[PDB]
Design a protein around this ligand. Sequence first.
Ligand SMILES: Nc1nc2c(ncn2[C@@H]2O[C@H](COP(=O)(O)OP(=O)(O)OP(=O)(O)O)[C@@H](O)[C@H]2O)c(=O)[nH]1
Ligand SMILES: [Mg+2]
Lengths: 177, 180, 18, 415
Amino acid sequence: EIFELKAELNSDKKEKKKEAVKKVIASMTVGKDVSALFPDVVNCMQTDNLELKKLVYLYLMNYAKSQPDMAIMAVNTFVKDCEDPNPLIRALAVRTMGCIRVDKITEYLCEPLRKCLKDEDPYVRKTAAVCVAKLHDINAQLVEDQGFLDTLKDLISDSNPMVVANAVAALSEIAES
Amino acid sequence: GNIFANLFKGLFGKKEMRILMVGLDAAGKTTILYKLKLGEIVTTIPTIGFNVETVEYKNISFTVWDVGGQDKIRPLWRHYFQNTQGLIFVVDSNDRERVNEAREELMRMLAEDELRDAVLLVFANKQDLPNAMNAAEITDKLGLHSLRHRNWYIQATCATSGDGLYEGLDWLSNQLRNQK
Amino acid sequence: DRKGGSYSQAAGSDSAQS
Amino acid sequence: SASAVYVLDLKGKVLICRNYRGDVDMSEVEHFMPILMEKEEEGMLSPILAHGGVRFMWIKHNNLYLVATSKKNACVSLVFSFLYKVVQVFSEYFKELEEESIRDNFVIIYELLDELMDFGYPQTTDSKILQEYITQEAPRPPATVTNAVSWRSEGIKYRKNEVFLDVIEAVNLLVSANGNVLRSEIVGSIKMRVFLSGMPELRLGLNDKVLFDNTGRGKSKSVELEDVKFHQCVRLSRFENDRTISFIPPDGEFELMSYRLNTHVKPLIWIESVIEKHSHSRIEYMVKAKSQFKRRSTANNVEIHIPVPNDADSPKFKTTVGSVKWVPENSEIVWSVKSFPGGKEYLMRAHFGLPSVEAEDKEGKPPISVKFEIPYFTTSGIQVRYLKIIEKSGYQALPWVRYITQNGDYQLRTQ
Ligand SMILES: Nc1nc2c(ncn2[C@@H]2O[C@H](COP(=O)(O)OP(=O)(O)OP(=O)(O)O)[C@@H](O)[C@H]2O)c(=O)[nH]1
Ligand SMILES: [Mg+2]
C-alpha cells in the first residue's frame, strides 16, 4: 500500500507516477493521511504533465502546514514554474504560492509575486493580485515591505476589467483588515 | 523466456545511465549541468531546491539532478541519492576557504553505505583563473586517491569555456558502461 | 411538431417604427 | 467570504472539500452534521450554520450539502451566488448530481474548484469558458475570460444560423379557501437557444408597454412586466437609456429576459373542491374543474391534485373526463387529464372509507394544486416584434420562438 505507492512514485514511468498521484489524491479525498508521502512526492514534482503538476501543487498546499520543514524543497520548483510560458501554469503557481501557509515560504515568494504583479495576461494579473492579497492577509508587514499596495492601486486604473475588479477586491480586503 | 526484444533494443542503443549534480554553492554545478544539457553559460538564481534535467550523449540519457550547496540544501542531498546511479561533484578551486567545506561535504557523501555503487566524479570547477588548481592538486587536497572502493576521477572544466566536459562525460560513460 | 407551442419565425425589428 | 467551500453527503461524509483562505480548520465540517441534526430536531435548522465564531453556510443539493464554511463577516449573498454558480457548473459538466459523480470526476473536480475561485473570491464562472480550459478527458486560459465579452465566445462556426426561442409563461394563482385569489402573478421567461456562426449581437424587440408608450404606439396590446431582468450578455446601459435590448447571444440555451408582473385576469383553470368527509365513515370528493382559458387553447397534461385523507383507503373515483389515480406515497388524488380543451367542465365524485380508529394527530390541509400546461397560448398578450441579429461577416439568420403556457404556483387553498 504505502510502500507500493512510494515505490511507484519513485519510478521513472509516467503512467505509474500518474497512477500513484491519482491513488494519493483519492486516499486524501477519502480521508487518508497522505502527508507522510509528501517528501517522496517532492522529488516527483517537476513534471511536464499539467495534470500531475496540479495534483502535486494541491498535495503541497494541503501538506504544507502539516510538514512545513518538507516544504522547503519546493521553493525552487515554484520559482521555476512562475516563469512558465503557459498562462495556466503561471496562474496555478501564483495560486499555490499564496495558498501555502508557510512563514518562510512567502518570504522567498516576494520576488515571484513582484514579477507576476506586472503580468500582461488578465488571468495572470488576477492571480498575482490574489497572491498579493493572500500574502498581505498572512503577513501584512511583508506585503507593506514588498510595496504591493501601489501595484494593487494602479491595477484598478488599467485594462483587464476582470483583473481590475480582482485588484480592487484585493485592495478592499487589505484595507478591510 | 525470450530476450529477443531486449537484444533488438540494445542493438541500436538501450542503455541510458544516470548522473548526479552535487557540490558547494557557486561551484559551477548549475553551470556545468546547463553546459552538459544545453551548452551555454547562463546565469541562474541560487538553487534553493534542486534542478532536474536529462542529457543524452553516446546513445545514453545521463540524467543530472542538480543539488545546491546551501546549508539548508546540503542535508537534502540524501533525498536525491535515492534512485540515483551516478554523482558528479563540482569543486571550487578558486575558493580556498570553501575548498575545505567542499572536501568535507564530498567525504560525508562518500561515507554513506547507501552511496557506495556510485563512482566518484570530481570536476575542477572554476578552471579559468590562475588561482584554480590543477587536476592533481585539487584531488590531493580533497583526498580523492584515498577513496578506496570508489572510482574517482579528477577533471578540470571551465564553465565559461566548457572544455573538459566531453572528457568527463566520456570518463563517466566508461566507468558506468562496460560494453563495446 | 413539438409540445408547448410550435416554433414560429421572428422578425428583425419593428418595421412600423422606422 | 467563505473560508472553504466543501461538498458534503447524505450521511455527513464530505464528498470533496477545497479550502480557499485557510483561516478555518477543516475539522469544523464534522461538527456541521450534529449542528444540522440538532437544528432539524428543534426547528432551528437554517442554511447558514454557525459553529462558534465561524459560520458554515450550507445549501441543500441533490445528494450532498454544499457547506461553505466562513469565518469573518463575508458576503452571504456573494457566498450564495458562488454556490449557485458552482452547482450550475457541476450540472453542466456532470449530468448527475450525486455521490456517483462526486467520486468519479475528482481529478477534474479539484482543478475546476481551484480555477473557479482563489482566496475566497470567485474568478471563473462561465460553464463554456471553464470547459474550454479544464476538461475531464491543459492549454492556456481562453481570451474570452480576459476580454470584455465573456458570454459570447468568438470564432464559433456553424453550418446554419438557427436560434430556438421559448416564450415560457408561468401562471401562479394563490386562491384561498374562501374562493378568492390572493397571489395571482405571472412570470415571463424569454429563453433562446442561439446556435449560429460567430458572435452576433442580438437586438431584442417586443411589444413592451414602456417601449410602445415611448414610441407613441401605446394603443395596442402591450405586455407591461413589473420586473424585467436582463441576461448577463444583455447590456443594461441600452435598456436604461432607451429600452434597447442589445447584447451578444450566448452559444447555446440561455435566458435573455424574464418578465415578472402581477396578473389581474381570471384563472386559466377554475377548480372547485367539495369535501363530503363523514365522521370516520366515508369521504366525498366533489371536485369540479372549469376551463377559464380560451377554447382554442388546450391544456395538455392537466393534473389537478386533490389531497385525499392520509388514512383514507378503498377509494372510488366517479369522474367524467380525465383519469383519476390515487398515489399512496403522495397521499392525494390527482385528476390527470391528457388533453384539457379550453372551456371544458370536468366533474369528479370521490368516495372512500376511513378507519374506525381516529388519528392521533392532525395532518393539516395542504392546498390543491393543478399542473395545467397549455402551449401556444399567450395569456399576457406580449408579442415579440423583432430580433436584431447582426454579424460582422454578414449572414441571414432564421431565429425561431415558441410560446408555452403552464401552471406555476397555481395552488388553491383547501376548505
Ligand atoms: N563566470 C564564471 N562563473 C563560474 C565559472 N566557473 C564556475 N563558475 C561559478 O558557477 C556559478 C553559476 O551559478 P549556478 O548556475 O547557480 O550554478 P552553481 O555554481 O551550482 O550555483 P548554485 O546553483 O546556487 O549552487 C557562478 O556563480 C560561478 O561562481 C567560470 O568559469 N566563469
Ligand atoms: Mg545550480
